[PDB]
Amino acid sequence: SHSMRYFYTAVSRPGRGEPRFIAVGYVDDTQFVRFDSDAASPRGEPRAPWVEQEGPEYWDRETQKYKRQAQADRVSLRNLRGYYNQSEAGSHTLQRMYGCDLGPDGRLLRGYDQSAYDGKDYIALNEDLRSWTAADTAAQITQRKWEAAREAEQWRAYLEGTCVEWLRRYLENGKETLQRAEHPKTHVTHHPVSDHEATLRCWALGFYPAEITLTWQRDGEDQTQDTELVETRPAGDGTFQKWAAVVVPSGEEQRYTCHVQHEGLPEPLTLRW
């Protein structure tokens, strides 16, 4: 399966100028666009090669969208303070994430849209793409505005149409990277801590997509509570890293095996020191 997902953040900064608006768009775990209202000449900018080739009409159009949405979010931040009677002296955040998921058949599996104010759920498009759920009485004001605008219809048309159509186009233009999972390069390192025990660290490097499972077993049994497992982190070149470590008694290293599951592996890997 595949997804296109957008992430919008608007953050006010009282006494330090207008609120900053940032938009990022991803296919799966690959960023392909960004807009930053603080940039020297704010525009939508490509972040992946498979949209660098869309032409000036595409880019200008996206740019216009982001510039107008930044303006709107600034008004929206003021509206939200009005609903809650919050002072202009405090900073606030508006977040919105929307996108579409495709199943193995290339068909829409689900579209979504959700907003948060200061980190709390505020309003969300329902699963039927025809109505909203408001989290509190301020968001019910927003819901009645969007209902009067009949905006859910515009979400349905986008999520079931445009979002799917353009996700499929990106997947095709970028298939040599987006549809070809890069398996983790793996190894085990050993770090004695005393004459009598040592850390075994199992490494997964340079993989894509980010989803992975890394576990240590002792004699074939799981070592969950004895494994230090870092969160998956970006290498910064589009691939990811992770490691898992266990502290083992000297001489007992052969009892331990590291197990790696990743979409780029034909079959799960078992590794040893």
Partner: peptide, 9 residues
């Protein structure tokens, strides 16, 4: 491809 401009909150 992004969503068109959305009504204000």
């Amino acid at each position: 491809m992004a969503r068109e401009l959305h009504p204000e909150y």
